[PDB]
Design a protein around this ligand. Structure first.
Ligand SMILES: [Zn+2]
Ligand SMILES: [Zn+2]
Ligand SMILES: [Zn+2]
Ligand SMILES: [Zn+2]
Lengths: 291, 291, 291, 291
């Protein structure tokens, strides 16, 4: 069921915004986000290695936790999530509907606080941490599914791929495929918040772009495939998410707004025949309380 | 964009519930429900007839309104919805995100109250009412998309198709295709609330199964393709929706719970090799406030 | 296996011939032709009615024989095919590969001799005749699969659908759907050989356009959906089939050249933004010794 | 057109042969073989490097010539193919249909003569040689399309992948993906003729298994992904190809019988629930005079 439903998502051209921008719509996944792919890969790996006797505990900003909970619900794994109290309340409710357990961690501690608590619960319960920031299967999910899909959906002609970095899974897996095919003929652009520009060589900080900018450089981030880093302001991301819904009818989340805002800045630096691709990580109904 | 994204949704087998039941997952549509199909068909028809000079006004229990708003947002139509105040608050928020206008009508007046207000606004603004309860394009959407999809996805072997009646579009369009192919070899079962059993020959009444049981028999309901009517209690529908999320990882709405609860009663009356198909009209995140 | 592989074929636009024409590629079917669809439907229907206990006998000089032989091979039905002995060594070989029993009837004579022999085999062995020219399930296969596919693949915008009539199944089933959706907004154009223009009111004659022009009006032909008839000369058909290979890289059969030759004549009488769709029934490699 | 049609081919399970075997049907490609993928990738790469101004010349006796001719026809590249004059009238015809220029070199001699003639044509005309045995884009086509497809189509569960080596492109690219995902959990099995077992450490010889066993080790063969080599006799291959047609209704070529014959040998050494996947490179109707 899950193996079959996850991936093979559609791409749309954003004609009412900039007709050079194509948005891959990951909300079509059964868990409602891109994170279904890495969750599936990391889980199948841990099962075959015999690591899930006591279930799974994973820190999350929301989406990876929802994906793990969904797959765990179907496959019969106990799932515990830790997540900062600052993530949208919709996340908490979804996790509960999926019968997962949740421990909220302090907002000012961000993703590091969630990781810390997850490490504790893992030791206390014996639940296995998939560790999205270090697990190479996160990258393999995008290397073997997302990247191949994007490559063919764009008819093997792409000038730039633009993606927010959360775990770094998406840009790394997709970037490996695209650099493999295009070499220097394609630009791979990482997106991060202006408020937390760690990839640009700056300081971590509080920001509102849920799902990106963890405040540190993930171990799985494959820097050799990344050409540049662009920053996006919080209000830029929200504005674009809202614009996508009103002008394209696309019910996409905050990080999709950030991706598209950044893709627009990329496309403007290039010619009229530029082909720019980005991802819409999730849907707008996960953000009704704040978007 | 919309023409391309709408439809071609997947089917899953509910092994952790009853392995004779296959659920078509309509939440994969870009508007997050089955209603994307009839909305697209009715809109394309009204455009080609030159009826949308002043936009669209339609009454809704939520999903048809969201679909119309989404397509209107992309195609450039002004969209006004009327909807009972008793429908989930998520509906109202989505309509606003899509830049549609909304007039809430009294809860005790139900769908009839919404229709009445929509007729008023139509006259006042000149906006065109697509009229989901009378428009044959509602039925054609399921006759030309949903039904053909279901027929092939089930490898041309179906013992029963089970669906809630809202507008009656789905059961009518799908039932025409399936009766066309199977004749009396397939049973077509209409689902309604026990609290409002109009199709069984009873009285209209207040119920909690959002999206079904409008309290009257729609004009587009094709009674010649319907074999029986089954009733479902409110708590049955909610319980099943919850069970689908916890045991299958399927984030489906209330009417999906009602469909599956009814499909289970159908399958139990049949043999161990029975093939029963139903629809999951929408997703669970449209119901976080109440489910 | 066959239920899964048959149908859902791609469409392409004929940019090197006329960019207003779109070509549905039925050679992508496992039997290499459009006839996989009606054969499947006729066989599933006959199975369901318990009519296949002593196998299948069918008189056929064309793709229906391959489709039947192929489905019969997988499903475990005995398949006897009657064919005038004038049929190519290419076709005999394929039928024999699929384990059909070939009954060759006296030649110049023709298809009548094959029909007569099939009727006696049916009496002598109990084998069931599907009768492709009379069986409504031929039409339903197109009403329930091909037409729905085309409608959506053309994003619900079609000014004309153009198709050769062999059995009349394709034009009738697709025509029903397209008339249903578009009404008089779509023109349905039947194609036939200039040498055998029976649908135009003329006399049957010998022609070389494989797959079309039986020299009678088939029982299953839905005349109510057909707006006009257009004729194609044998050499128009062969020349266009060759051109499709040469300039589009499309290895299509003789009937495909006929369809596209006709569609070209249709398109030229319409505006610059007209949308014309037609079918490529089979593949070139079935005709290497004559094309 | 070609970017859209190539790849995304179906898999079937060989229930009438051994239900542990799954067969990827590459005949569904517009060129009727697996070689559409590497041809597309090699040509797109060469175009991008501006290497195709005077066209393409390639020495090829098999499906690569068809793929190149077909892509060349649509894209507007001059295609010259060199082939020993010992090649069938069937293949010459198809190549000529696609508008390739056929350069026939002295026979018994063989493929070396064709390579030598291509090298001089390249010098004399400026035409660019893709060199399918050395070009890494042959491997990438499978790494980026075929392997990703197989991984998902098998629901991420594969005990063995079995494939004939022609160029070694298919086994290398798929093998990279499957090794990447499964590690030592998957066995990658290369197939070659008993008459020409060079990968097994033996001597090159003449054989009748079309599409495999070039009688050298191709430069692009990723030996690091191959776990074992298995041999197949010419008559094993032809017999299995015939059986696939007869009992599965699958019109597959000679190399497909070889692959399935090998996969059968593999499956028999494994448990009852083993999952073995293999490829059907091309179709039967390309071999009517010998199969
Ligand atoms: Zn596009
Ligand atoms: Zn199933
Ligand atoms: Zn098109
Ligand atoms: Zn399978």
């Amino acid at each position: 069921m899950m193996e079959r439903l996850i991936g093979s998502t559609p791409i749309v051209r954003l004609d009412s915004i900039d007709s050079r921008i194509a948005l891959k719509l990951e909300k079509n996944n059964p868990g409602g986000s891109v994170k279904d792919r890495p969750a599936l890969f990391m889980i199948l790996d841990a099962e075959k290695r015999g690591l899930l006797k006591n279930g799974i505990v994973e820190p999350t900003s929301g989406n990876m936790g929802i994906a793990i909970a969904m797959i765990g619900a179907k496959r019969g794994h106990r799932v515990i999530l830790t997540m900062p109290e600052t993530m949208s309340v919709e996340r908490r409710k979804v996790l509960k509907m999926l019968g997962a357990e949740l421990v909220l961690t302090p907002g000012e501690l961000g993703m590091k606080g969630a990781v810390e608590k997850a490490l504790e619960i893992s030791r206390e319960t014996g639940a296995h941490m998939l560790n999205q920031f270090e697990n190479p299967y996160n990258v393999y999910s995008h290397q073997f599914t997302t990247g191949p899909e994007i490559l063919k959906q764009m008819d093997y002609q792409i000038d730039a791929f633009v993606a927010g970095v959360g775990t770094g899974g998406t840009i790394s897996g997709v970037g490996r495929v695209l650099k493999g095919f295009f070499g220097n003929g394609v630009k791979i652009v990482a997106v991060e918040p202006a408020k937390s520009p760690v990839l640009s060589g700056g300081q971590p900080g509080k920001h509102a772009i849920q799902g990106i900018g963890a405040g540190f450089v993930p171990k799985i981030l494959d820097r050799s495939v990344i050409d540049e880093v662009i920053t996006v302001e919080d209000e830029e991301a929200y504005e674009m998410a809202r614009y996508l819904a009103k002008k394209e009818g696309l019910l996409v989340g905050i990080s999709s707004g950030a991706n598209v805002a950044a893709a627009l800045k990329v496309a403007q630096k290039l010619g009229p025949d530029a082909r720019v691709v980005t991802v819409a990580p999730d849907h707008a109904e996960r953000y009704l309380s704040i978007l």
